[PDB]
């Protein structure tokens, strides 16, 4: 027997039970009705949804290997079963393991992630000053910071903030994440063959993915022509070197195409989610100026107005720590996670879950638990503050997921969020164009991601 769920119709399945523009809300509605594990058909693809901390944790932690597969995502068919993110094949385990180890090597030491982020803060602060306290759209300014950070690890390359190629890549990342959060792409994701050769915004996503891949492909090729296996320059070099070291084996983990997919995965994933979180963070703080003020107080007391922020500052800045945690919790940036897949026939809570079934370990339902976070729908730093006014740790903080497919750059992202928000607020006050009271924090699109409203602001200097 399958987990309980709604009776499906011919062709469309349970499409009437879903609001295309807010799938996460529909999951939640279905959870009250059927419980923390339920079956759904969207089209002819059967899925099982986990909802709530217990179900999600059990799925990812007690059934590690059973649900460690990756569900298909037609828009990213040019990556399927290659690289990391969209890899449901036999190369996933080893490519992931090697990529994690390599990322850790580049993150460790005095030339590590902290220093890399600190250097990049210089350019970020420079760009913010150059706005002269005039209105500007933050989207493609602040996004440069994580984009350059991951580019350094991948290509040992640094872009000027208005390099045309650089802006184009970020534009593509932004459009994709945006469009992948819209009702049309949600329909396409589930009915790809009915919809693919019709007109629609799905074509742009597909075109955009191919364009990022092509750019990464050329970079991989330029690295292969000028390689020195004794002195690795970046992550692509390490992957290229690993490819030569297996040239006489039976089965191959590394293709030139496998590597560009792997690196385009990291490039896209290393840029877009960090950029969106920061951008969403700035909007949030502008709605709550008293929160911005307390942060300004903590920075000036602990770090002072001049010294560059460092990761260990987190340990002496409980309010910033709580705020950075609360931004990630409140926005539920990837609210349905990435789709998992059953690797074999599995019995979960006495329910049959057949091989190939899509498994959805819902994240918003963990981030919005009303027992762990009383008033979950509200932005409150005190969701992460104890009695002593100190940081209050929570296991329900899972915006990166958990288990075998846990976000490959969790540590990078968290250090970026802390250091860069610290840097920004050390040197600037945030000025909204509209009154704080009229700021709407609701996402404008909800799908693969949660998309912030478009806005402009001024940043007014603190330092001179
Ligand atoms: C706020 C920033 C970020 C968020 C919210 C986020 C979130 C996530 C989530 C929810 C998943 C799916 C986990 C699962 O399937 O169980 C994921 C996967 C992944 N992320 Fe992130 N991530 C962020 C930053 C990053 C960064 C900086 C990188 C690269 C350095 C990155 C690379 C990846 C990769 C390669 C995967 C696929 C893992 C796999 O399939 O085995 N992410 N991320
Ligand atoms: O169809 C799903 C979803 O797509 C939207 C736009 O997001 O409309 C698309 O599909 C309609 C067919 O149902 C077309 O008439 C329209 O041209 C196309 O944009 C939403 O209206 C709809 O919910
Ligand atoms: C389709 C892939 C998903 C997406 O678009 O945004 C989140 C997820 C890819 C991802 C994983 N970690 C960071 N990102 C950007």
From Swiss-Prot:
| Pathway(s) | Lipid metabolism; fatty acid metabolism
Binding of heme, residues:
407
What turns on expression?
A: By ethanol and isoniazid.
Q: Please provide the record's keywords in A-Z order.
A: Endoplasmic reticulum, Fatty acid metabolism, Heme, Iron, Lipid metabolism, Membrane, Metal-binding, Microsome, Mitochondrion, Mitochondrion inner membrane, Monooxygenase, NADP, Oxidoreductase
* Result, substituting residue 359 to I: In allele CYP2E1*3
Reaction(s) the record says it catalyses? an organic molecule + reduced [NADPH--hemoprotein reductase] + O2 = an alcohol + oxidized [NADPH--hemoprotein reductase] + H2O + H(+); (5Z,8Z,11Z)-eicosatrienoate + reduced [NADPH--hemoprotein reductase] + O2 = 19-hydroxy-(5Z,8Z,11Z)-eicosatrienoate + oxidized [NADPH--hemoprotein reductase] + H2O + H(+); (5Z,8Z,11Z,14Z,17Z)-eicosapentaenoate + reduced [NADPH--hemoprotein reductase] + O2 = 19-hydroxy-(5Z,8Z,11Z,14Z,17Z)-eicosapentaenoate + oxidized [NADPH--hemoprotein reductase] + H2O + H(+); (4Z,7Z,10Z,13Z,16Z,19Z)-docosahexaenoate + reduced [NADPH--hemoprotein reductase] + O2 = 21-hydroxy-(4Z,7Z,10Z,13Z,16Z,19Z)-docosahexaenoate + oxidized [NADPH--hemoprotein reductase] + H2O + H(+)
Question: Which GO biological process entries does UniProt record here?
Answer: 4-nitrophenol metabolic process; benzene metabolic process; carbon tetrachloride metabolic process; epoxygenase P450 pathway; halogenated hydrocarbon metabolic process; lipid hydroxylation; long-chain fatty acid biosynthetic process; long-chain fatty acid metabolic process
Q: Where in the cell is it found?
A: Endoplasmic reticulum membrane; Microsome membrane; Mitochondrion inner membrane
One MF term from GO for this chain? oxidoreductase activity
Membrane topology of the entry: Peripheral membrane protein
Broad class of where this protein is predominantly found: endoplasmic reticulum
Against Gene3D superfamilies, the record matches this protein to:
Cytochrome P450 (1.10.630.10)
**Top-level taxon of the source organism:** Eukaryota
What does the entry list under GO cellular component?
Answer: cytoplasm; endoplasmic reticulum membrane; intracellular membrane-bounded organelle; mitochondrial inner membrane
Q: What is reported on the regulation of this protein's activity?
A: The omega-1 hydroxylase activity is stimulated by cytochrome b5.
EC main class here is oxidoreductase
Which annotated residues bind substrate? 268-273
Names of the cofactor(s): heme
Q: Which InterPro entries match?
A: Cyt_P450, Cyt_P450_CS, Cyt_P450_E_grp-I, Cyt_P450_E_grp-I_CYP2E-like, Cyt_P450_sf, Cytochrome_P450_fam2
User: Do you know which Pfam families this protein is assigned to?
Assistant: p450 (PF00067)
Q: Report the EC code(s) recorded for this entry.
A: 1.14.14.1, 1.14.13.n7
State the family named in the UniProt similarity comment for this chain: Belongs to the cytochrome P450 family.
Q: How does it assemble?
A: Interacts with chaperones HSP70 and HSP90; this interaction is required for initial targeting to mitochondria.
Q: What does this protein do?
A: A cytochrome P450 monooxygenase involved in the metabolism of fatty acids. Mechanistically, uses molecular oxygen inserting one oxygen atom into a substrate, and reducing the second into a water molecule, with two electrons provided by NADPH via cytochrome P450 reductase (NADPH--hemoprotein reductase). Catalyzes the hydroxylation of carbon-hydrogen bonds. Hydroxylates fatty acids specifically at the omega-1 position displaying the highest catalytic activity for saturated fatty acids. May be involved in the oxidative metabolism of xenobiotics.
Q: What is this protein called?
A: Cytochrome P450 2E1
| Organism the protein comes from | Homo sapiens
């Amino acid at each position: 027997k399958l987990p309980p769920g709604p009776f499906p119709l011919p062709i469309i399945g349970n499409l009437f039970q879903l609001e295309l523009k807010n799938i996460p809300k529909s999951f939640t509605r279905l959870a009250q009705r059927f419980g923390p594990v339920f079956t759904l058909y969207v089209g002819s693809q059967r899925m099982v949804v986990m909802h709530g901390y217990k179900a999600v944790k059990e799925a990812l932690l007690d059934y590690k290997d059973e649900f460690s597969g990756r569900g298909d995502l037609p828009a990213f068919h040019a990556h399927r079963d290659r690289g990391i993110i969209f890899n449901n094949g036999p190369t996933w385990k080893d490519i992931r393991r090697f990529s994690l180890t390599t990322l850790r090597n580049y993150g460790m030491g005095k030339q590590g992630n902290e220093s890399r982020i600190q250097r990049e803060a210089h350019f970020l602060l420079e760009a913010l000053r150059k706005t002269q306290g005039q209105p500007f759209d933050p989207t493609f300014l602040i996004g440069c910071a994580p984009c350059n950070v991951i580019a350094d690890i991948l290509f040992r390359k640094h872009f000027d903030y208005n390099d045309e190629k650089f802006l184009r890549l970020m534009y593509l990342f932004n459009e994709n994440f945006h469009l992948l959060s819209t009702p049309w792409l949600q329909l396409y994701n589930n009915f790809p063959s009915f919809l693919h050769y019709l007109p629609g915004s799905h074509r742009k996503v597909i075109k955009n993915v191919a364009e990022v891949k092509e750019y990464v492909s050329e970079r991989v090729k330029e690295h292969h022509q000028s390689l020195d296996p004794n002195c690795p320059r970046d992550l692509t070099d390490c992957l290229l070197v690993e490819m030569e070291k297996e040239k006489h084996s039976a089965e191959r983990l590394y293709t030139m195409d496998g590597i560009t997919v792997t690196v385009a995965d990291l490039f896209f994933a290393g840029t877009e989610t960090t950029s969106t979180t920061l951008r969403y963070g700035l909007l949030i703080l502008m709605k709550y100026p008293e929160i911005e003020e307390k942060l300004h107080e903590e920075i000036d007391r602990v770090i002072g107005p001049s010294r560059i922020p460092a990761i260990k500052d987190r340990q002496e800045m409980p309010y910033m720590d709580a705020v950075v945690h609360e931004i990630q919790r409140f926005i539920t940036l990837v609210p349905s996670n990435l789709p998992h897949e059953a690797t074999r026939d599995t019995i979960f809570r006495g329910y049959l879950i057949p091989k190939g079934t899509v498994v959805v370990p819902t994240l918003d339902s963990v981030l919005y638990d009303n027992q762990e976070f009383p008033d979950p729908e509200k932005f409150k730093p005190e969701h992460f503050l104890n009695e002593n006014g100190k940081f209050k740790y929570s296991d329900y903080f899972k915006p990166f997921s958990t288990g075998k497919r846990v976000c490959a750059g969790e540590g990078l992202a968290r250090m970026e969020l802390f250091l860069l928000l610290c840097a920004i607020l050390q040197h600037f006050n945030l000025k909204p164009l509209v009154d704080p009271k009229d700021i709407d924090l609701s996402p404008i699109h909800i799908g693969f991601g949660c998309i912030p409203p478009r806005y402009k602001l001024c940043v007014i200097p603190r330092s001179h």
